[PDB]
Each structure stands twice: as C-alpha cells, then as structure tokens.
C-alpha cells in the first residue's frame, strides 16, 4: 500500500542519484539495488561431515610443526609463518581444517536468523572449500579455519608462499530447497596489496579469482577486474609512499568510510556461487563473504506486498 509506494519513490530516486554519481569515489560504476540480506549471523550453527577431520588445537599445532612450520625453526620465514598460524589456530570458535588438493570439504551453517533474499528467509548456507594450489611443500595441503558465523566465513594460510582455494556457496530456504540469489550483491572486501611482512616481502597480494558471476567495479577503488574474472589491485593499496591513496589502517575495516578503496561488488548469476580465494606472501588471510557491500548509494530493492563478536574477533586478529 502506502508504505510500499513511499519505498518505491525513495528507491527509484536513489537509483537516479546512483546514476548521476556513477563515476564518483565509492559509488557503483553501474547502478544496482540490493536484494540480498546476508550480513550477520552470530547464532548460526556450524557443522562439518564426519568424512572430514576437524583437527584439535594441539593436534594441528603438532602437525604443522612436523611440516617445518615451527617457532623453533631457524628459518625466519617458517617461524614467522608459524606465528601467524598459531594466532588463528588458538581461537576456539573456528573449525580447524587441513584441505587436500582437489578434495572438496563442505561447511554447513543452519539455524540462520537474520538473513533473506527478496523478502524470502534464508535458513541454511553451505560453503564448499577445495584447495586448488599452494606454493608450500608438494602443493597438496594447506590449513584453513571456518568461522562460527558464515558472514565472517574463513581464514586461510599460505605460510608466506601462496594459496588458491575454490569456494562454492549455496543458500537454502526454510524447507531445505536451493535458492537462486541471482541479482544479489556480495561484498568482496579487504583485497590488500602491499600489506605484507617487511622481512619476507611487502608485495603480498590478496585476490578473488574465477568468479562465476559479474563484478561491478567500485569507482575510485584499487580493485580492478583482470583475466579469468579475477579482482585485485595493480599496485600497493597499503602505503601512501608507494602510491596508495590511504594507508591500510585508514581504510581496511568493516566500518571505515574509505573501505570501498580495497573492495569490489559481485553480482550473483547462478544458484551455486563459485570463486577462488587467492593469496601470495600474506601468512594469514581473512576472507569474509557476505552482502555488506562497501559501495555508497546502493538502495535496498523494495518488496511489494502480496554488534558481532565474531567480526570483532577477526578484526582484532588482523
């Protein structure tokens, strides 16, 4: 009725502004509306199938040490790699995984409370992680950590070499039916370049690769589209001294007004979302997958009638 009419007026007006400000810093280069609400799920229930081994803290500590990634390793790269790993492995809210090359692992989240698409409740989300490559050792194993909250999502390691992990994402309704979230906008944020350890190499790169949807570049952002539908910065977005617009600490948070500077938006185009999380020389890499897009002036799509401790904990660990 009147509420929807008012929402429609405001929504179409916002699209006209987004059109007008297309090229302005922080705005979407092509105007869109947001129909996906997948923002925060601190009460999600995480489960992993028994065919997958969820490692204990000390069990994985010992395993990673057996690979040479140890605080008593004389090699500074290896001992530094351990230090980063140890910080994430010591958090009891993450499921601890050793991914094997080309062996998919599902992480299921049920009991979702706050999430929806186009007015329809999202009850379950399933992530599928598949290690594709890593520069570490024989290239067949790497550690990752799955958050209790599916919008905080994952940390992965590269032990200051490189890692490429494929991710599938599938969303389900209250009746367990697969939902097609085509048109929904997702936040590929915090894609740092030049934010590495100075001892090893400053030019660490975090990226999204092989995205099966369509990127919407944010105007003014360091994140550009590349070959194999990949998104990353071409030079440092970490240090003003190497040409970055802001230093990392001035943009790279979930609440910063400049956080668009290291972000791009993804438009979903399929029921099974697919992308690859890729890093080099970063040690620890937080990859959050959610609808909390960093672009300015994106209205919520109206539906016509017929804060978070897991985020805080991850931010502190950065």
CB of 23 to Ca ion, least distance (A): 26
- Do the Cβ atoms of 172 and 270 come closer than 8 Å? no
Task: Check residue 280 for interaction with Ca ion (CB under 5 A).
Answer: no
35 vs 290, beta carbon nearer Ca ion: 290
Region label for 35, one of left (φ > 0), alpha (ψ between -120 and 50) or beta (otherwise): alpha
Task: Check residue 292 for interaction with Ca ion (CB under 5 A).
Answer: no
CB of 212 to Ca ion, least distance (A): 22
- Is 206 one of the annotated binding-site residues? yes
CB of 318 to Ca ion, least distance (A): 7
What are the C-alpha distances in Å from 83 to residues 38, 40, 64, 160?
32, 29, 11, 11
Alpha-carbon Rg for the chain, nearest whole angstrom, is: 20
E strand intervals along 38-153:
45-47, 95-100, 105-110, 116-117, 120-121, 124-134, 141-146
Q: Which span (10-18, 151-159, 187-195, 196-204) binds Ca ion, by CB under 5 A? A: 187-195
Give the interface size with Ca ion as a residue count (CB under 5 A): 2
Helix (H, G, I), strand (E, B) or coil at 318: coil
Task: Check residue 190 for interaction with Ca ion (CB under 5 A).
Answer: yes
Q: Which residues contact 66 (CB under 8 A, 6 or more apart)?
A: none
Task: Check residue 284 for interaction with Ca ion (CB under 5 A).
Answer: no
105 vs 277, beta carbon nearer Ca ion: 277
Cα gap 273→292, rounded to integer Å: 17
CB of 251 to Ca ion, least distance (A): 11
What proportions of the chain, in percent to the nearest 5, are helix, strand and coil?
A: 20, 30, 50
CB of 286 to Ca ion, least distance (A): 6
- Is 192 one of the annotated binding-site residues? yes
68 vs 313, beta carbon nearer Ca ion: 313
Among 192, 207, 236, 291, binds Ca ion (CB under 5 A): 192
Q: Which residues contact 78 (CB under 8 A, 6 or more apart)?
A: 68, 69, 70, 159
Q: Which span (32-40, 78-86, 125-133, 191-199) binds Ca ion, by CB under 5 A? A: 191-199
CB of 46 to Ca ion, least distance (A): 22
147 vs 192, beta carbon nearer Ca ion: 192
213 vs 283, beta carbon nearer Ca ion: 283
- Strands of the sheet with 36-37, listed across from one edge: 36-37, 116-117, 120-121
Tell me the sheet residues that pair with 144.
97, 156
Task: Check residue 276 for interaction with Ca ion (CB under 5 A).
Answer: no
- Do the Cβ atoms of 213 and 180 come closer than 8 Å? no
190 vs 292, beta carbon nearer Ca ion: 190
CB of 166 to Ca ion, least distance (A): 19
- Is 59 one of the annotated binding-site residues? no
Q: Which residues contact 110 (CB under 8 A, 6 or more apart)?
A: 44, 45, 47, 123, 124
97 vs 191, beta carbon nearer Ca ion: 191
Please state the residue numbers annotated as binding site: 190, 192, 206
Contact residues for Ca ion, defined by CB under 5 A: 190, 192
Please state the residue numbers annotated as binding site for Ca(2+): 190, 192, 206
């Amino acid at each position: 009725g009147a509420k929807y009419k008012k929402e429609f007026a405001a929504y179409t007006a916002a699209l006209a502004e987004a059109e007008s400000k297309k090229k302005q810093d922080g705005y979407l280069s092509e105007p869109r509306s947001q129909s996906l609400n997948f923002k925060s799920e601190p009460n999600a229930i995480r489960t992993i199938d028994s065919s997958v081994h969820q490692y204990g803290q000390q069990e994985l500590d010992a395993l990673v040490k057996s690979w040479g990634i140890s605080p008593t390793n004389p090699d500074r790269k290896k001992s530094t790699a351990y230090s980063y790993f140890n910080a994430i492995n010591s958090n009891n809210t993450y499921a601890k995984l050793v991914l094997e090359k080309d062996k998919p692992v599902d992480v299921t989240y049920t009991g979702l409370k706050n999430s929806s698409f186009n007015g329809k409740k999202i009850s379950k989300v399933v992530y599928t992680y598949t290690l594709k490559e890593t520069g570490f050792n024989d290239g067949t194993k790497m550690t990752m950590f799955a958050s209790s909250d599916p919008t905080v999502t994952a940390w992965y390691n590269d032990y200051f070499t490189s890692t490429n992990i494929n991710v599938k994402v599938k969303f389900y309704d209250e009746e367990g039916q697969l939902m097609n979230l085509t048109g929904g906008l997702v936040n590929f944020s915090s894609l740092n370049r030049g934010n590495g350890s100075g001892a090893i190499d400053k030019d660490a790169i975090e990226s999204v690769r092989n995205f099966n949807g369509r990127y919407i570049p944010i105007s003014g952002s360091s994140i550009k589209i590349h070959e194999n539908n990949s998104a990353y910065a071409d030079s440092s977005n970490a240090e003003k001294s190497l040409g970055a617009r802001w230093n990392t600490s001035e943009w790279d948070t979930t609440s910063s007004p400049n956080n668009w500077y290291g972000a791009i938006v993804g438009e979903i185009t399929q029921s099974e979302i697919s992308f690859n999380m890729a890093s080099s020389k970063s040690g620890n890499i937080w990859f959050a997958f959610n609808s909390n897009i960093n672009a300015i002036g994106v209205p919520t799509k109206p539906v016509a009638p017929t804060e978070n401790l897991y985020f805080q904990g991850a931010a502190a660990l950065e």
